[PDB]
Design a protein around this nucleic acid. Structure first.
Length: 91
DNA sequence: AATAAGAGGAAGTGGG
DNA sequence: TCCCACTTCCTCTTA
C-alpha cells in the first residue's frame, strides 16, 4: 500500500488535484493545502487506502504529524503548509 | 458564539 | 509476538 507522503508527492508531480494542493517552493519541498478544497483530497486518500470510514483532512493531518519525528514530512509555520525531506524528494 | 488550524494521547486495524 | 503505518476517536489550545 502506498504511503501517505508518497500519495501527496505523486499528486504534486501529476498535477491531478491542483486546486487542493500545490507547491510553495518545490526546490525546498514545501507545499500547501487549499483551505476550501482539501477535503476532496482527503476523501481520495481514504478511498485509495480502502479505509472503513470516510477520510477527513483532520485525520489525514493526524497521520502527517507522525512523520515529524522521522522527518519525511514536517509542518512549516505557515497556514496549511508542510515540507518533504530531501530524502523523500530525491526518491 | 461559529469556524477552523494545529495538536497529541490512546486505542483499533493491516499486513507483515 | 510485536512492530508497521496509519486510522479512529476524543479532547484541548489558539486565533
Amino acid at each position: 500500500k502506498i504511503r501517505l507522503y508518497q500519495f501527496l508527492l505523486d499528486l504534486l508531480r501529476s498535477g491531478d488535484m491542483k486546486d487542493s494542493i500545490w507547491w510553495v517552493d518545490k526546490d525546498k519541498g514545501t507545499f500547501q493545502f487549499s483551505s476550501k478544497h482539501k477535503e476532496a483530497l482527503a476523501h481520495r486518500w481514504g478511498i485509495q487506502k480502502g479505509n472503513r470510514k470516510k477520510m477527513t483532512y483532520q485525520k489525514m493531518a493526524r497521520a502527517l504529524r507522525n512523520y515529524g519525528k522521522t522527518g519525511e514530512v514536517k509542518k512549516v509555520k505557515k497556514k496549511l503548509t508542510y515540507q518533504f525531506s530531501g530524502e523523500v524528494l530525491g526518491r
